[PDB]
């Protein structure tokens, strides 16, 4: 009995899967901490990609 | 259930079931396994060592079944059989095996499967499914 | 991910579709009029894909 079985059917998850129906979360720095004037820097390190 | 069986596998199914049977036979025999009435593991006695037709029938009840869901169950998943030849059905020939690893059963249970067997990537992850499948049948038993 | 996806056959006969242009163009290039250059490129592209 040689079963001649489907093509595998690749699936792809595209941000489907998620938690609740909230998609986003924004971190800022407080409003009075705003820059007029100047050369400024900061670091974002990456814990996941 | 909206499943329906092709011919070919309804004439293959009780043979194929009988000697499955003898296949678990067969392996737990190879695990240490020695017939007896009473059903206890710790003791090493249980009577569905014997034979299919000596094999009681509610077991074999629920074997049949169980070779049916999952005849079923491969073709709900799209997969497509054939009968290749009738050789290969016919013929059971093999080189003789030792009484020690051998079963009061006639016929030798392994085919001549040395290198020429194989199963792709596709068939191992179908194997996969039906044990998941297997598993979630079982758990929803339990559940009831 | 999600499209895209040339079917084997029809890399298969894309494969054909090379080989016999190229059974063609072979031994019979004095015949087309200096568009040879133009089968050439045809015949480099298909190489590539
Ligand atoms: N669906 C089933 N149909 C028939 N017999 C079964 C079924 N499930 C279990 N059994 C029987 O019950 C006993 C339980 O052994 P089994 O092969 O299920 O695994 P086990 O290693 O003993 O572990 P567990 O305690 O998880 O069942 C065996 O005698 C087995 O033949």
């Given at each position: 009995?040689?079963?001649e079985?489907?093509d595998?059917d690749?699936?792809?998850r595209?941000?489907?899967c ?5 998609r ?6 407080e ?5 007029k ?6 670091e974002?390190?990456?814990?996941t990609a | ?7 070919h596998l ?7 079931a009988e ?6 036979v067969?392996?737990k ?8 009435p009473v ?7 249980h009577?569905?060592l014997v034979?299919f ?5 509610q ?11 999952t005849l ?26 030792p ?10 249970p ?6 020429f ?6 068939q191992?992850?179908m194997?996969?499914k039906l044990a998941?499948?297997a598993?979630?049948?079982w ?6 | ?6 079917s084997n056959?029809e890399?298969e006969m894309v494969?054909s579709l090379?080989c ?15 568009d ?7 015949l480099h592209?298909l190489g590539?894909?």
């Amino acid at each position: 009995y040689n079963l001649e079985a489907p093509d595998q059917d690749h699936a792809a998850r595209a941000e489907v899967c998620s938690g609740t129906g909230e998609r986003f979360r924004i971190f800022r720095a407080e409003k009075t901490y705003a820059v007029k004037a100047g050369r400024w820097y900061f670091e974002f390190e990456t814990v996941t990609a | 259930s909206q499943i329906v069986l092709p011919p070919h596998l309804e004439r293959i199914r009780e043979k194929l079931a009988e000697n499955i049977h003898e296949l678990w036979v067969m392996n737990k025999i190879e695990l240490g396994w020695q017939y007896g009435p009473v059903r206890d593991d710790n003791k090493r006695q249980h009577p569905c060592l014997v034979e299919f037709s000596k094999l009681p029938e509610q077991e074999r009840n629920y074997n049949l079944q169980m070779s049916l869901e999952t005849l079923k169950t491969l073709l709900a998943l799209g997969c497509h059989v054939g009968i290749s030849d009738e050789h290969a059905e016919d013929k059971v020939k093999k080189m003789k095996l030792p009484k020690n690893y051998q079963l009061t059963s006639g016929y030798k249970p392994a085919p001549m499967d040395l290198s020429f067997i194989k199963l792709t990537p596709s068939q191992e992850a179908m194997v996969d499914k039906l044990a998941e499948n297997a598993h979630n049948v079982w758990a929803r038993d339990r559940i009831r | 991910c999600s499209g895209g996806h040339a079917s084997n056959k029809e890399k298969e006969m894309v494969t054909s579709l090379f080989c016999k242009l190229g059974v063609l163009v072979r031994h019979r290039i004095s015949l087309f009029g200096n568009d040879a250059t133009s089968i050439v490129n045809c015949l480099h592209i298909l190489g590539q894909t």
